[PDB]
Design a protein around this ligand. Structure first.
Ligand SMILES: CCCCCCCCCCCCCCCCCC(=O)OC[C@H](COP(=O)([O-])OCC(O)COP(=O)([O-])OC[C@@H](COC(=O)CCCCCCCCCCCCCCCCC)OC(=O)CCCCCCCCCCCCCCCCC)OC(=O)CCCCCCCCCCCCCCCCC
Ligand SMILES: CCCCCCCCCCCCCCCCCC(=O)OC[C@H](COP(=O)([O-])OCC(O)COP(=O)([O-])OC[C@@H](COC(=O)CCCCCCCCCCCCCCCCC)OC(=O)CCCCCCCCCCCCCCCCC)OC(=O)CCCCCCCCCCCCCCCCC
Ligand SMILES: CCCCCCCCCCCCCCCCC[C@@H](O)O[C@H](CO[C@H](O)CCCCCCCCCCCCCCC)COP(=O)(O)OCC[N+](C)(C)C
Ligand SMILES: CCCCCCCCCCCCCCCCC[C@@H](O)O[C@H](CO[C@H](O)CCCCCCCCCCCCCCC)COP(=O)(O)OCC[N+](C)(C)C
Ligand SMILES: CCCCCCCC/C=C\CCCCCCCC(=O)O[C@H](COC(=O)CCCCCCC/C=C/CCCCCCCC)COP(=O)(O)OCCN
Ligand SMILES: CCCCCCCCCCCC(=O)SCCNC(=O)CCNC(=O)[C@H](O)C(C)(C)COP(=O)(O)O
Lengths: 178, 88, 52, 459, 69, 175, 56
């Protein structure tokens, strides 16, 4: 979720994703670790059997038949990590994530507590203000006239420069905000 | 209370522990900055299993687009620290 | 809200309960029916001549 | 009854002789005091009405309507003084004058003894409303909305006038007491059928009845906040009050002339309630819930039973309060993000915790959670409808299920989930908005302890 | 270590709630005290028969002192 | 209590069995009842008696209102609005009183059902019978008037019922 | 100093006196509908030896 996507996935990416998905579902079917190790080694052997096939039509046909095999043989209730998109704790803490701009609306009595925190916040705000034009300039110069082909962003190439469009990535609330 | 405040050194220790428990990679040769392909001569299929082992170790799922890039233990440690908001 | 809560019983609900108690007591002792099927007395009603 | 009318009339010179920065304070204080004086009309009799004079009388049906009308003016003034800040002094005073004239017309409308005077005031309420909508509405559609508001109503009420002066030419009077005592049955003839239609369609358009309800989603949506508050809370109830008043002359003709309207109401309840499920505009969703709620009042008045009349009175009052609160709640978000799209601003419970509580309570009263008077009126109407025909329980039951669905949906879309990232101008709630919500919700809950005060003359 | 918790400004909700509580109590507490004092020291009337040749006033048909007033 | 008339709200003589313990174990209910009396009931009675001494120092009365009997709708002429008004007001008062009579009978029925326990189907026959008659009379008198009821519509309903009864009685006499 | 208050706060008595006046206009109205005062068949009553009207 941090890397920019590409226009497509190559054959190698597709077969690797199939390998990982099939291994995860196999682990869902084989609850115990020794049985999982056995059948996962068998799965790896089955994948290695055609590791160096050079006929792209044949490789594509084999990958397609593998997909058809997986869809029929998938676990209807696969194991999901608790914070993964299908898990039981996927977006549980989103109600606690509060954007930092809300701090600007605190009453001065609220800001009277935490003086050091708000002095540091003022320094951060000044830093964000002072480097915006350089970041915009960098983006315009680097990008092609038609527009940007991909969502990849450039790093800071000078010394006193920050990477363009950094504020919202850096000031993410937290993963356990409260 | 809940889980302790996991630190950077702990992440590195666990990553290297899991790697040293892999039969394909010998313990003495392995280094934090070692590339999984140039340094260890490991195939793409082999790399996927390391990523899954890291998921099982730390109990969270790394997306496939993010996962393929990780070629060094330091890269894995940095990714995990970025996800868990670990600053020391 | 206080003013509305203590409004006097101009709807005559307690009055109606008292009157109903009085008539129930009177009728039961008498042995008369508790309630009457016809509200208006038959003697004061002049029905049309004949049923056909 | 002049002890309420004359103080209301004095709000005009008081507003026009006030300082540039004191109009809101004076108007709010004195309209609240007028509400306090209006509370004395709730002392009603069990047998006949409070006949003040030859011109004005008060009944157990019009007294709660009067109290709600007087109570709504301070809330409208509180809700209006935020978006009229940059306005000039004279135009602020003109807006307040429009509101005061509207209140005066409504107060006289609810207490007129004679049906022609009632008609004249009930039609006079159009001018201030149209001026408010078409002068202080925000978008270009407000003009069209005004036309829809003007001509739907008049096309209904112009026959009514022709009927009324016809009736006085044959019975001799239009006084409501005389009309009720000297009542006679309506024969089964084409002339009587069209007289029945002329006496009913004017009120049906005001409710409005499903089929002639198009003007409402335009007028309520395009109006300013006080315009929509008064349109939903009081102006819709004019049709219910007039139908309840005029039904006496209609019998026994109503038994068969009510079928098309009962079918339209019992099906349009489902239609508008389901329309609320797919509505991208929040204010439009709130507007459609009103049509769905007033279909039930139409059914209750058409079936003509004491339980149905009690239920219709209770539901009219409860809907007035709840719909006004919902319109205000939507306006709070509109004055932040300047868009009425429901999915534009999400996750607001995180950023505005107490306004979320207000939203929850308003949604709970909208879906008629017991023991709220919304539920009392709804359940009384449902019981009377079941007596009228058991199969009605299917339609009535279905409506209840749908009403809860679009209410909580409205709650889940705007309050739960995650807040949109780009918006960053969501300021904390003002005391004015919080008090405006509280003054809507507290009387609603307090009316649960004394429901006989809102159950009408059939209690 | 203790961390900062990013929250929306809770000052204004709390201020509104304490203002509403104060302005309700300012009249409610005196009303409650007055009602209980009236109840304790001036109880309800007692139902009696109308003495012969006496016409009661209209307020003499209710039993609660506040309602009579 | 002397608050209400016992003839209009009757109840059986309240037969209560004497306690006849068989075991030697202490009764926890008796200990709890003594505790409740000593800690709860006594302060309540003290406060109540203080309130009653304060009440007895001020004594005033309120009177039940008596209404004269006026001519009914049957004696009113067709367009005599004042007699129609008085007859209609008296009719409305009588309707309210009849509603409260039915309410009293229903309260008797409910109290009987609760009191009799598992033998209510047999021991509440009198209350069910009284309610059936009162309900039949009330239904004959006011059923189907609808919204906008009046004494005139009630009179028309009664006249229609008497015409039906007269025709039914004439039919039987011909057999 | 009285003018500094009165001249900008007199609009605060328009609605109060407008209320008072309203009550007055009600009472006069009640004086035009006395044709049946102490004449109804339900409330007709012998006057007390001092009272003049049963109601105002
Ligand atoms: C049975 C309960 C017994 C109650 C004892 C007496 C309590 C009297 C309270 C009266 C209501 C107050 C007015 C409502 C607005 C509150 C204003 C406010 O913002 O407070 C913030 C204040 C400060 O909190 P905060 O930290 O600043 O809040 C930050 C966020 O806002 C976060 O806030 P939050 O997340 O805490 O949200 C507030 C909270 C509470 O907020 C509310 O929901 C208030 C509105 C309740 C729902 C009403 C609408 C639904 C339709 C039914 C209406 C019933 C009306 C009954 C008559 C009311 C007369 C006033 O939300 C809820 O708890 C869930 C509400 C849903 C209730 C579900 C149950 C409904 C039926 C209950 C039975 C009703 C009949 C009882 C009698 C039955 C036979 C014995 O919180 C409180 O002080 C507590 C709020 C009161 C909760 C009472 C819940 C039960 C109410 C029952 C009705 C009244 C019955 C009284 C007679 C005895 C019964
Ligand atoms: C916080 C901000 C948020 C706001 C929230 C939203 C609200 C918005 C604003 C709305 C404004 C409110 C407007 C409403 C006004 C209505 C007032 C009214 O009509 O009063 C009626 C009513 C009084 O009736 P009444 O007709 O005037 O009196 C008739 C009798 O003649 C009189 O009887 P009596 O003469 O025999 O004696 C009675 C007398 C005398 O009482 C006694 O002294 C007897 C006590 C006996 C104690 C026994 C032991 C104590 C002493 C023993 C030891 C001493 C001696 C030994 C010493 C040695 C020590 C061992 O006591 C009283 O008179 C009661 C005082 C009335 C207080 C009313 C409270 C409302 C005031 C309105 C403003 C409220 C604004 C809020 C401020 C509130 C400030 C508090 O007031 C009540 O509260 C009655 C309630 C009693 C029920 C008990 C509980 C029953 C439980 C059943 C339910 C269970 C289900 C579960 C649900 C539980 C939920 C609680
Ligand atoms: C923030 C924290 C929240 C929780 C903490 C709060 C603490 C608890 C406070 C809440 C109290 C709970 C209520 C419990 C019920 C007791 C109150 C009850 O006794 O009063 C009722 C009385 O309530 C009133 O009747 C209802 C008030 C009427 C409401 C009118 C609103 C004011 C006008 C505003 C305009 C709005 C327009 C309305 C259009 C119609 C009983 O009625 P009634 O059986 O008789 O009384 C018998 C004795 N009498 C007759 C001698 C008086
Ligand atoms: C979308 C929202 C619009 C508002 C909805 C308003 C609904 C108005 C409908 C009016 C209800 C009934 C009207 C008249 C009653 C019966 C009408 C007719 O269909 O029934 C027969 C009427 O007989 C014939 O059918 C004559 C009517 C046929 C000509 C009229 C055309 C109706 C077609 C529908 C037009 C759409 C209406 C809305 C216009 C915009 C009854 O048989 P009959 O025993 O003989 O007549 C008895 C009536 N008497 C006593 C007066 C003599
Ligand atoms: C927002 C849209 C609302 C539409 C409302 C319009 C419908 C109103 C109902 C009809 C209005 C005209 C009725 C006239 C007033 C009745 C008074 C009356 O009783 O007069 C009748 C006469 O009734 C009529 O003449 C009416 C006939 C129709 C004339 C105008 C036609 C209007 C269109 C008719 C159908 C539309 C009505 C329903 C449409 C609903 C809305 C879509 C009998 O009097 P006499 O002549 O003295 O008879 C006894 C002695 N001979
Ligand atoms: C419960 C589970 C359900 C069962 C699932 C069924 C799945 C089918 C089982 C057998 C799998 C196949 O057919 S295998 C797919 C058929 N075709 C090929 O394999 C083409 C040759 N592949 C390459 O050349 C790549 O290099 C690559 C091999 C990806 C390595 O790449 P690296 O080394 O550079 O990472």
């Amino acid at each position: 979720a941090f890397s920019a996507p590409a226009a497509y996935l190559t054959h190698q990416q597709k077969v690797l994703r199939l390998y990982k998905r099939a291994l995860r579902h196999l682990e869902s079917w084989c609850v115990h670790r020794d049985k999982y190790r056995y059948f996962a080694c068998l799965m790896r052997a089955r994948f290695d059997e055609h590791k160096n096939e050079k006929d792209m039509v044949k490789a594509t046909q084999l990958l397609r038949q593998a997909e058809e095999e997986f869809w029929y043989g998938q676990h209807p209730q696969p194991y999901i990590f608790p914070e993964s998109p299908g898990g039981t704790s996927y977006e549980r803490y989103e109600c606690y994530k509060v954007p930092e701009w809300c701090l600007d609306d605190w009453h001065p009595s609220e800001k009277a507590m935490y003086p050091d925190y708000f002095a540091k916040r003022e320094q951060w705000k000044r830093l964000r203000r002072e480097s915006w034009e350089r970041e915009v300039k960098q983006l315009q110069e680097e990008t092609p006239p038609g527009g940007p082909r991909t969502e990849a962003l450039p790093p800071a190439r000078k010394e006193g420069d920050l990477p363009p469009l950094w504020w919202h990535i850096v000031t993410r609330p937290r993963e356990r905000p409260m | 209370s809940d889980a302790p405040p996991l630190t950077l050194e702990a992440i590195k220790d666990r990553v290297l522990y899991v790697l040293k428990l892999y039969d394909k990679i010998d313990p003495e040769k392995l280094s934090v900055n070692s590339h999984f392909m140039k340094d260890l001569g490991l195939d793409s299929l082999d790399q996927v299993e390391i990523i899954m082992a890291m998921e099982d170790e730390f109990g969270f799922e790394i997306p496939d687009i993010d996962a393929e890039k990780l070629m060094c233990p330091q890269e894995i440690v940095d990714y995990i620290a970025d996800k868990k908001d670990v600053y020391e | 809200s206080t003013f509305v809560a203590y409004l006097p019983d101009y709807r005559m609900q307690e009055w109606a309960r008292r009157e109903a108690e009085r008539l129930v007591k009177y009728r039961e002792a008498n042995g008369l029916p508790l309630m009457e099927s016809n509200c208006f007395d038959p003697n004061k009603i002049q029905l049309p001549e004949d049923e056909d | 009854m002049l002890k309420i009318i004359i103080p209301t009339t004095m709000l005009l010179p008081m507003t026009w002789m006030s300082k540039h920065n004191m109009i809101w304070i004076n108007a709010t204080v004195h309209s609240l005091l007028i509400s306090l004086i209006s509370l004395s009309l709730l002392n009603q009799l069990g047998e006949n009405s409070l006949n003040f004079s030859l011109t004005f009388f008060s009944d157990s049906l019009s007294a709660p309507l009067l109290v709600l009308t007087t109570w709504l003016l301070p809330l409208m003034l509180m809700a209006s003084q935020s978006h009229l800040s940059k306005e000039t002094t004279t135009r602020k005073k003109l807006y307040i004058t429009m509101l005061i004239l509207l209140q005066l017309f409504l107060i006289m409308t609810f207490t007129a003894t004679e049906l022609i005077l009632f008609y004249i005031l009930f039609e006079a309420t159009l001018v201030p409303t149209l001026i408010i909508i078409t002068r202080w509405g925000n978008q270009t559609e407000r003009l069209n909305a005004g036309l829809y508001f003007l001509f739907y109503t008049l096309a209904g009420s112009l026959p009514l006038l022709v009927a009324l002066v016809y009736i006085q030419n044959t019975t001799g009077s239009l006084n409501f007491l005389i009309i009720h005592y000297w009542s006679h049955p309506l024969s089964n003839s084409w002339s009587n059928i069209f007289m029945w239609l002329a006496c009913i369609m004017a009120f049906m358009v005001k409710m409005p009845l499903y089929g002639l309800h198009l003007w409402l989603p335009k007028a309520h949506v395009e109006a300013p906040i006080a315009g929509s508050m008064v349109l939903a809370a009081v102006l819709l109830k004019l049709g219910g009050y007039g139908m309840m008043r005029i039904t006496t002359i209609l019998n026994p003709l109503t038994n068969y002339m009510a079928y098309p309207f009962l079918m339209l109401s019992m099906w349009g309840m489902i239609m508008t309630s389901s329309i609320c499920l797919r509505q991208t505009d929040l204010k439009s969703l709130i507007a459609y819930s009103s049509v769905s709620h007033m279909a039930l009042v139409i059914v209750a008045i058409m079936i003509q039973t004491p339980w149905s009349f009690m239920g219709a009175t209770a539901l009219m009052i409860a809907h007035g309060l709840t719909s006004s609160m919902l319109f205000c709640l939507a306006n709070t978000n509109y004055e932040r993000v300047h868009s009425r799209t429901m999915i534009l601003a999400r996750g607001l419970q995180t950023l505005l915790p107490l306004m979320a509580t207000w939203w929850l309570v308003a949604s709970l009263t909208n879906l008629a959670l017991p023991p709220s008077i919304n539920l009392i009126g709804e359940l009384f109407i449902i019981t009377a409808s079941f007596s009228w025909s058991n199969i009605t329980i299917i339609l009535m039951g279905m409506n209840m299920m749908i009403t809860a669905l679009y209410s909580l949906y409205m709650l889940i879309t705007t309050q739960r989930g995650k807040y949109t990232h780009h918006i960053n101008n969501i300021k904390p709630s003002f005391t004015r908005e919080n008090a405006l919500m509280a003054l809507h919700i507290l009387p609603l809950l307090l009316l649960t302890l004394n429901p006989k005060m809102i159950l009408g003359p059939l209690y | 270590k203790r961390l900062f918790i990013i929250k929306p400004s809770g000052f204004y909700d709390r201020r509104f709630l304490k203002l509403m509580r104060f302005y309700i109590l300012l009249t409610g507490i005196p009303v409650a005290i007055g009602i209980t004092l009236v109840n304790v020291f001036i109880g309800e009337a007692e139902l009696a028969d109308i003495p012969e040749g006496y016409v009661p006033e209209h307020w003499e048909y209710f039993k609660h002192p506040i309602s009579r007033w | 209590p002397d608050s209400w008339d016992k003839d209009v709200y009757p109840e059986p003589p309240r037969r209560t069995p004497a306690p006849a313990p068989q075991t030697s174990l202490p009764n926890p209910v008796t200990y709890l009842t003594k505790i409740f009396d000593l800690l709860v009931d006594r302060p309540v009675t003290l406060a109540r008696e203080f309130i009653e001494q304060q009440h007895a120092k001020n004594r005033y009365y309120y009177y039940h209102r008596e209404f004269r009997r006026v001519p009914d709708i049957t004696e009113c002429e067709e367009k005599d609005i004042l007699c129609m008004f008085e007859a209609e007001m008296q009719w409305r008062r009588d309707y309210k009183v009849d509603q409260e009579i039915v309410n009293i009978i229903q309260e008797r029925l409910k109290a009987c059902q609760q009191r009799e326990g598992e033998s209510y189907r047999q021991n509440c026959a009198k209350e069910l019978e009284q309610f059936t008659q009162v309900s039949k009379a009330f239904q004959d008198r006011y059923s189907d008037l609808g919204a906008h009821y009046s004494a005139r519509k009630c009179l028309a309903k009664q006249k229609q019922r008497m015409l039906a009864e007269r025709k039914a009685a004439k039919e039987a006499a011909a057999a | 100093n009285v003018l500094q208050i009165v001249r900008d706060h007199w609009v605060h008595i328009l609605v109060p006196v407008g209320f008072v006046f309203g009550c007055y206009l009600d009472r006069r109205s009640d004086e035009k509908l006395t044709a049946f005062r102490n004449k109804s068949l339900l409330f007709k009553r012998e006057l007390r030896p001092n009272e003049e009207v049963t109601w105002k």
